[PDB]
Amino acid sequence: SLCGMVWGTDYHKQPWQAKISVIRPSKGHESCMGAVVSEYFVLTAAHCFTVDDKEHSIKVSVGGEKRDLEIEVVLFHPNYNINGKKEAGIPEFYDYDVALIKLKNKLKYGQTIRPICLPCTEGTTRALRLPPTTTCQQQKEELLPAQDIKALFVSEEEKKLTRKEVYIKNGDKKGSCERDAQYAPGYDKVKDISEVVTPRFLCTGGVSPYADPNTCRGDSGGPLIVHKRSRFIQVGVISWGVVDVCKNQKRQKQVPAHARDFHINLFQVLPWLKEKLQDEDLGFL
Ligand SMILES: CO[C@H]1CCN(Cc2c(C)cc(C)c3[nH]ccc23)[C@H](CO)C1
């Protein structure tokens, strides 16, 4: 497929966006986002589901449609466990916070429903107009160089999408961005912050080099996207933030230099993506 290409407003501009609603909602468990990655699969965050009967715990829609898609199986990353660091006084642990929604029915791609490119695929090689000798490490050097990286995510409200520009701190601001996990309630006592911020995470947010918009809980599972030569490449999955600016803008205005968002780096979950998606004709390297 020609991934990460516009085929207009809202889903005409971001046709890989998926909207997830929690069926039995509660405070902190209302909504998520995801990304169409193939005709049968939506990529999202594991923490969007109930661990029991995952398949009946959400509805998912694409293309800004009213209709819900039939969910056949939900596949959690096997390393994911929100309770895995409770003994270290870490109440919620978001390492490997990624899940695949396997749809019963094949999606029909159109103007409002298209797949996004994934890292280390032939789709991304072609989208970035790279040669057939291209390796996964070269794609990583192209997409996540050691610098502040221009990127974007999308928030949804009543079928309307808002694209937000953010910068991934992957250069000399990386350590500062990661250490700011201590501003997140519940992570403020851990002595070694690399216990919460593992190598699975990319870090956005803050006011340098630009005033990054922050994520909210309902953005969980949405794609973190790099825009290159009119193509959109997913590099991350929104996992967790220091401050939910939908609920607590007050707190972000108190600590704006430290208001970071954390995303699962898809380059760090490739063996799982490659295995689960091996029959989807995406041509993993
Ligand atoms: C361990 O708890 C800390 C991390 C998770 N935070 C909530 C949260 C989740 C779950 C997911 C996304 C995308 C969020 N975006 C902004 C906030 C936020 C809480 C409260 O900020 C503090």
- Quote the ligand 1 centre to 114 CA distance (angstroms): 29
Structure determination method: X-ray
> Does ligand 1 have an atom closer than 6 angstroms to the CB of 241?
yes
SS3 of 75-104: EECCCCCCCCCHHHCCCCCCCCCCEEEEEC
CA dihedral of 109, 38, 61, 78, whole degrees rounded to 10: 180
CB 82 within 8 A of CB 239: no
Residue 284 lies in a domain: no
Q: Which secondary structure element, helix H or strand E, spans residue 225, and what is its range?
A: strand 223-228
Q: Is 237 exposed, middle or buried (0-12, 13-18, 19+ CB in 10 A)?
A: buried
The type of residue at 9 is T
Greatest alpha-carbon span in the chain: 50
Q: Which domain holds residue 193?
A: 10-276
CB 104 within 8 A of CB 45: no
When divided into structural domains, the chain yields a total of 1
Question: Which tokens is 253 given?
Answer: 């205005």
H-helix segments, 104-260? 122-127, 136-143, 174-179, 249-254
H-helix segments, 144-186? 174-179
Question: Residue 281: which region, alpha, beta or left (left: phi > 0; alpha: psi -120 to 50)?
Answer: left
Structure letter (DSSP) for residue 117: B
CB 219 within 8 A of CB 212: no
Residue 234: CA atoms inside 13 Å, Cβ hemisphere, count? 35
Peptide bond into 209 cis (omega under 30): yes
Residue 177 lies in a domain: yes
Residue 30 lies in a domain: yes
Q: How much of the chain is in helix, strand and coil states, percent to nearest 5?
A: 20, 30, 45
Distances (CA, A) of 160 to 195, 227, 248, 260: 37, 20, 22, 25
The CATH number for 259's domain is 2.40.10.120
Residue 157 lies in a domain: yes
Nearest ligand 1 atom to the CA of 92 is 1
- Quote the ligand 1 centre to 249 CA distance (angstroms): 13
Distances (CA, A) of 161 to 19, 49, 164, 283: 10, 23, 10, 30
Q: Which residues contact 51 (CB under 8 A, 6 or more apart)?
A: none
| β-bridge mates for residue 163, sequence order | 154
Please report where in the chains the tokens 């695949």 appear, as a residue: 100
The type of residue at 242 is V
Residue 1 lies in a domain: no
Residue 257 lies in a domain: yes
CB 31 within 8 A of CB 49: no
Taking the C-alpha atoms of residue 71 and residue 62, their distance in angstroms, rounded to an integer, is 13
